[PDB]
Amino acid sequence: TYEYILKDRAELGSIKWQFMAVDEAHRLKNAESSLYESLNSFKVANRMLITGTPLQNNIKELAALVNFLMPGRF
């Protein structure tokens, strides 16, 4: 659950992970999120978001999604 991520950010951060799944990943809408840089610490190799979030409402999220999957790329 999304609660539990943040309540125990630390223990998962240490153990290695290389594959990520998330449900209804329109959460990462703003680039100022708490789970937005919470997820970045979890040593990871590949990610996988899966939601139908429309990506023209704001250009922020369109960019946020691109920045989050690939840190660096417009």
DSSP-assigned beta bridge partners for residue 64: none
Residue 9's φ and ψ, nearest 5 degrees, are: -65, -40
Measured distance CA(54)–CA(3) in Å, rounded? 25
- The minimum distance between CB 54 and DNA, in angstroms, equals 11
Binds DNA by CB under 7 A, chosen from 30, 40, 41, 51: 30
Binds DNA by CB under 7 A, chosen from 23, 32, 56, 59: 32
- The minimum distance between CB 42 and DNA, in angstroms, equals 14
Binds DNA by CB under 7 A, chosen from 20, 33, 49, 53: 33
Residues 6 or more apart whose Cβ sits within 8 Å of residue 16? 43
